[PDB]
Amino acid sequence: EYVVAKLDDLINWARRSSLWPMTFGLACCAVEMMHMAAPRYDMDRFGVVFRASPRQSDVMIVAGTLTNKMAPALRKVYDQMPEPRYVVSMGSCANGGGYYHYSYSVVRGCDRIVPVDIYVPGCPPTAEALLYGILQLQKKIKREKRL
Amino acid sequence: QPDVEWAEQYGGAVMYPTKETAHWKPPPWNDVDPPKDTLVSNLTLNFGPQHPAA
Ligand SMILES: NC(=O)c1ccc[n+]([C@@H]2O[C@H](COP(=O)([O-])OP(=O)(O)OC[C@H]3O[C@@H](n4cnc5c(N)ncnc54)[C@H](OP(=O)(O)O)[C@@H]3O)[C@@H](O)[C@H]2O)c1
Ligand code: SF4
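^ Those are the sequences you sent over. The predicted structure of the assembly is below.
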């Protein structure tokens, strides 16, 4: 009744505590994604530990432009993730092409390939604005399993 | 006198010939031809696409 309701929040507290990102070296957004590891604006053991390998991680951050050559590649990586998974599409390329969009190769918005939970709009995604991409992620995890 | 026709019977094969099996070939004079053929042993890798840390 009360113990059951608090135990579900305790499991959700583990995702609120720590989430491991994926080092998607996809574009210029990946350089600012490296700035999350940079000391001045840090999530290093604040709630983020870089390790790579899609099998171990909990959150994958799509960091830039995706093309038709990359659409089969990213899709199965998301499938290689453990079932409690979150996708953060960071940048205008990740939201529907920086420019592009009306281009031949670029797939529009990532959502055509892989579903996204948290959007970051910033081209040069400022590390200040990037910090929401992990903090809002933890805030969005509220309730899991009622019955 | 003995000729080449009698010498061909004593050639490298099976001495007495016949038998159920005659798949064996005379040995090469200075060991076998290189079995350079078969098995490329080329290992293919998909190292790139996304996140190789490199
Ligand atoms: N075996 C078969 O494949 C077969 C054969 C012949 C006919 N059919 C028909 O085809 C349909 C197949 O559907 P399905 O069985 O694949 O659906 P399902 O997997 O049972 O999914 C139904 C979803 O609706 C929610 N839901 C249903 N009743 C609920 C309730 N009383 N309270 C709260 N949430 C509820 C569930 O959410 P939660 O999980 O969060 O509760 C669940 O995610 C059936 O309706 C059946 O009539 C199926
Ligand atoms: S959104 Fe801007 S910074 Fe990010 S990959 Fe596209 S062009 Fe580069």
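The interface with chain B takes residues 22-26, 52-54, 70, 73-74, 77 of chain A (CB under 8 Å). The longest helix of chain A spans residues 3-17.

Shout if you want it in another format.
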